Amino acid sequence: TVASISSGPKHTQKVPILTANETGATMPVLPSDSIETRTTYMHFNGSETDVECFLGRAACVHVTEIQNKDATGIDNHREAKLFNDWKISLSSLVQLRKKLELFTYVRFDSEYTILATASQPDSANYSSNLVVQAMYVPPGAPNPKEWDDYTWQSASNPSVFFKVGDTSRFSVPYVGLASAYNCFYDGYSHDDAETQYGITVLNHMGSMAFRIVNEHDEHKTLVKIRVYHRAKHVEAWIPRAPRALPYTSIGRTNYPKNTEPVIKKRKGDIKSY
Amino acid sequence: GYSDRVQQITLGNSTITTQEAANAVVCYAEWPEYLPDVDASDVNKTSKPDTSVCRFYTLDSKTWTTGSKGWCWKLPDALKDMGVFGQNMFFHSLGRSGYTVHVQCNATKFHSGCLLVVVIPEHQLASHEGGNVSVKYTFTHPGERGIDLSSANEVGGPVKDVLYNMNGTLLGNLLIFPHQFINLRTNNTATIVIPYINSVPIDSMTRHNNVSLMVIPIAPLTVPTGATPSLPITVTIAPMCTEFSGIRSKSIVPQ
Amino acid sequence: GLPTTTLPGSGQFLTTDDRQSPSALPNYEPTPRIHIPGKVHNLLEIIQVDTLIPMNNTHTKDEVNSYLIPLNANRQNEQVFGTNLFIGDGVFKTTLLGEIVQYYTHWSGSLRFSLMYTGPALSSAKLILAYTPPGARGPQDRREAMLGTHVVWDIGLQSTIVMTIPWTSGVQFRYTDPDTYTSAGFLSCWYQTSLILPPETTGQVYLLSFISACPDFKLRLMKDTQTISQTVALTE
Amino acid sequence: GLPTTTLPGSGQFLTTDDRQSPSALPNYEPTPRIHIPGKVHNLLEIIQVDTLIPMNNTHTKDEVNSYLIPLNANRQNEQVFGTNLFIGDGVFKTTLLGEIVQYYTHWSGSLRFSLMYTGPALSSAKLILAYTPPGARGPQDRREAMLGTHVVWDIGLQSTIVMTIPWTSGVQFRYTDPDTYTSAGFLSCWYQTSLILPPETTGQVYLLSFISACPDFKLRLMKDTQTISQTVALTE
Amino acid sequence: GPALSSAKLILAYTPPGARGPQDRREAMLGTHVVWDIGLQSTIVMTIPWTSGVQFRYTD
Amino acid sequence: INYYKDAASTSSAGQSLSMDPSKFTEPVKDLMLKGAPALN
Amino acid sequence: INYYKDAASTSSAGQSLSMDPSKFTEPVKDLMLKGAPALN
Numbered sequence A: 001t002v003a004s005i006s007s008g009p010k011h012t013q014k015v016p017i018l019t020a021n022e023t024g025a026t027m028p029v030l031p032s033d034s035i036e037t038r039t040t041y042m043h044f045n046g047s048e049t050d051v052e053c054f055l056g057r058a059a060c061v062h063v064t065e066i067q068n069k070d071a072t073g074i075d076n077h078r079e080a081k082l083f084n085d086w087k088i089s090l091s092s093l094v095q096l097r098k099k100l101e102l103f104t105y106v107r108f109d110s111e112y113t114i115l116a117t118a119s120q121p122d123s124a125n126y127s128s129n130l131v132v133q134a135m136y137v138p139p140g141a142p143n144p145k146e147w148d149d150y151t152w153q154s155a156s157n158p159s160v161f162f163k164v165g166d167t168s169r170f171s172v173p174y175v176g177l178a179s180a181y182n183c184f185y186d187g188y189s190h191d192d193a194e195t196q197y198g199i200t201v202l203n204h205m206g207s208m209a210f211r212i213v214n215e216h217d218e219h220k221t222l223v224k225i226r227v228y229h230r231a232k233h234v235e236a237w238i239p240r241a242p243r244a245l246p247y248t249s250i251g252r253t254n255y256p257k258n259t260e261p262v263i264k265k266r267k268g269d270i271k272s273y
Numbered sequence B: 001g002y003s004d005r006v007q008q009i010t011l012g013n014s015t016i017t018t019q020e021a022a023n024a025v026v027c028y029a030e031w032p033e034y035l036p037d038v039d040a041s042d043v044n045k046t047s048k049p050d051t052s053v054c055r056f057y058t059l060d061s062k063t064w065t066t067g068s069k070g071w072c073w074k075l076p077d078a079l080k081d082m083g084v085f086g087q088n089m090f091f092h093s094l095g096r097s098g099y100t101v102h103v104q105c106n107a108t109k110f111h112s113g114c115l116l117v118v119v120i121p122e123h124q125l126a127s128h129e130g131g132n133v134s135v136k137y138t139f140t141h142p143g144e145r146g147i148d149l150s151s152a153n154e155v156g157g158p159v160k161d162v163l164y165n166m167n168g169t170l171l172g173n174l175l176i177f178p179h180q181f182i183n184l185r186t187n188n189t190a191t192i193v194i195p196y197i198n199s200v201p202i203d204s205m206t207r208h209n210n211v212s213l214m215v216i217p218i219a220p221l222t223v224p225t226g227a228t229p230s231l232p233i234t235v236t237i238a239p240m241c242t243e244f245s246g247i248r249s250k251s252i253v254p255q
Numbered sequence C, D: 001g002l003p004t005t006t007l008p009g010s011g012q013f014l015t016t017d018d019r020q021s022p023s024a025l026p027n028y029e030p031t032p033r034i035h036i037p038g039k040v041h042n043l044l045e046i047i048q049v050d051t052l053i054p055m056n057n058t059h060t061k062d063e064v065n066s067y068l069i070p071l072n073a074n075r076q077n078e079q080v081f082g083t084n085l086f087i088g089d090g091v092f093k094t095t096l097l098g099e100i101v102q103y104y105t106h107w108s109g110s111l112r113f114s115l116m117y118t119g120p121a122l123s124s125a126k127l128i129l130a131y132t133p134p135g136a137r138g139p140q141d142r143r144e145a146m147l148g149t150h151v152v153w154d155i156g157l158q159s160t161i162v163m164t165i166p167w168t169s170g171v172q173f174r175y176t177d178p179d180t181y182t183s184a185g186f187l188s189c190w191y192q193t194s195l196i197l198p199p200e201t202t203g204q205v206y207l208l209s210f211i212s213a214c215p216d217f218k219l220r221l222m223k224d225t226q227t228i229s230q231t232v233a234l235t236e
Numbered sequence E: 001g002p003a004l005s006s007a008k009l010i011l012a013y014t015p016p017g018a019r020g021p022q023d024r025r026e027a028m029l030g031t032h033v034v035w036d037i038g039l040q041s042t043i044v045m046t047i048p049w050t051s052g053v054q055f056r057y058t059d
Numbered sequence F, G: 001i002n003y004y005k006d007a008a009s010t011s012s013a014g015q016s017l018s019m020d021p022s023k024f025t026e027p028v029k030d031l032m033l034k035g036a037p038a039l040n
């Protein structure tokens, strides 16, 4: 492939460099339209800018935490982090978010990796290997109430059991209701006067719930869960302007008030170098 | 003697002529078309009013003055009240449509000024409150009036800050969306053909707007000496290939 | 039972590796795809669309005005604007090009810089745009500027001029984050003759300026952008 | 010894994975199969059999009577019953259809709603059943109702009427657990003319109503049902 | 008008059955042409025959 | 070799090697030739 | 590839792709045609 062809002096009536940008086109002008060039080859394919590659590496999408401790006398397991959940979503952590929102609709399979590490803040003894249970709780399923409810039987709901310190990995097909996931949605769930506006209404994907299977030892053990997400089989439509201001909320476009100028002011003139 | 410059668009029972055009943009290089069976889901036969809905509606005019910040209309909202297009809209459960948008602004060879005319698929607005305040329905359904970016923040309304496109992105990059400029010195109209763009084959016309049309002054209007300091901008829009499905009782929407 | 040996790296999680995994939802059938206009395949497809450069960066809070390069009637010989070419920083940084370049470590290729004139139709002007390849200072006067890559632009019916910064380089890749060894030059613009307004007209006229990449362009070695960060996880 | 590397996920137990295992009972011979009528292969086979809907839900303890929709002689213009179409909740919820839908997250397809009349043979009646697609309110009077999907039913020799709620939807799947965006409409029924009883006869007559899915139907993404739970393990 | 002026007018034909339009919004919903004043000096609008009965009276 | 039955479980996809910027860079209705005048 | 000798040790079975609701939806002795009267 040639990156530049050889081109010499020109004295024409045919001027490729004068255009009318009002038309909305970006005319494909090249170095050889306005200087004299020599042949050179590309030596490159643009492999690593493919959208599959761009969205295809694992990104941290969520960090939560649960603890193993005596539940005796706990009136609210959920509240003691005896188990915890996560209202699945991919917009909470914002590094991966800016990348996805370069597109309007996106379609992909997900590969999740879950790393779980333990911490023993209060001076301790022997730690017996804890086994985490991650179970997917889709919309309209008995949400779990204690850390050892019938829910955890999970007879119809996919769940994975792995050890703290290890990693769990599995992959979920594209579960969207439509043909693509909306990265943006300028609509409502119905024409009410006070119903929420955005996507949050659209990406009702239910939540994920974690717990330790082990009963309690004499000390307490903090287990912190990190969920990583990798898109595989990516398809993206309609590019948009990149995010300039900071994010404030999952699912709304809102930016913070009295934010700071995002364009760097010159130290000098327009004329400055 | 054909110029890129003169054009005629006849759609239904209405025709537009421009003698000072700058080509026309067809979003994503695709022209509006009906919904193919292979893509269909709802089993209902759809209704295609054709020429009674696919004609040109001219919205009320705006006034560009030296202080203007820009205006924003949403589709199909802007047309919610135009003739039979609008009736069909409130009466069917689902509908689908593409449009021809023609924005008009003429001046003289002594004026200067340049407007950006852009179509943004799925333009989800931001609340000026920050945090996770929502933007109430009425605020994103201004109707033919559209939203005036130089109007004041209101409560439950969107933010109207132009350098941020009403969503946290910079004005400068709106050029990645199908758009055309109106530069008084060149141009006097802008025309964009919009194919139907959605993640579902057909949708509700009232709970979801699928494009915002935005006209933004970028190089300020400058009139000749002792000229009146303003020009009107007119927007005429025509639904094209419209289909409605799931007819019934007639939606009632807030406000 | 087949005998195996495990190598160094067993059990590691590399966020960039690409392997098979069990599906949690065995046998599930995804929604059919329908057609949607606009599919993107390569980021190289989109960085060829031009977007506006806030060249007039001299303000103090972001404003529509930093996109406008002003022009003065009747000045002769003088300089319209100047900038270095660190596409990952400074004026370029918020543009779509600048914004994507920042997802990669290295770039190579030609850039296309165009200027669209917005003055009254009955005015006229001749400007010179000059690209100064690495190795010399930003030009200080047109004489200096005109000895490097340049285009005399004659403002006419055809409203925009497209200047190309041809890839001039020893090393075949440069860093997107500004680096010296790897630096690309300067871009300046001067009156060639001068802007002239018709009667009954007055004041400043402005140029809009765009930037996009030529088909020439290469970007490689993905990394994280300095353009976005956060202090606590967001919530709904 | 062949060199290997283990990946992330090694040692995990995913309740949904499908692999081989050693048999604990090597060489055991299972009992021969004999023929048994009734084999089921897909849950889609059984949700097409219709079952009764406790439409008359207005009681206070479960009774045979909530399966009976009453009809009054001589009323004109008035409304016989109304319900939304959240097949995973409310009247539908205990029906076989409702009961299976609850094992899945998403459903799509047409529903078949039929009414069998049980009044004396010498009586007569004309009813209108109306389906109101998402987007409008439950109809408030027949005029409103008759502008959407409807069937005038004439009570005759043929005892049942089968109304179909054709799949009317933007999005190709809806949630089985009630959700707004995803909501399906309303179903109402009104006197078209009115029930008329023969002489020597009196009182209320009832309609029985059934629900089953059309062959159209799709259910996907299995999950756990809210319809059953427990607090301690059972024993013998 | 002078050659250096400019204007955009809408001409509308309203078929029998409605009143003479009272504002452009009303006018623009019937047969109409947006005329852009340019180099080409004249605009030709056609009142297409819209009628139930195939002849009308001249009086 | 896929070891698993479902398609979601396969590795990353392989390069589009599609690449056609014209839907974004030249969505004009009447074709523009480089070198010919922009506005005729 | 089965690594094990016994049939119980193989993975899950593969979709019936049988599907015939008529034993449940139309177990009538004399065949009913849709469109013809139910009771003659």
Ligand SMILES: Cc1cc(CCCCCOc2ccc(C3=NCCO3)cc2)on1
Residues within 6 Å of the ligand: A088, A089, A090, A091, A110, A112, A134, A135, A136, A158, A159, A160, A172, A175, A181, A182, A203, A205, A208, C024
């Ligand atoms: C946009 C957008 C895209 C996504 C991701 C959707 C992923 C589908 C649901 O995700 C899961 C997560 C975990 C499990 C799981 N099953 C057993 C253990 O974890 C299943 C599906 O979220 N928002």
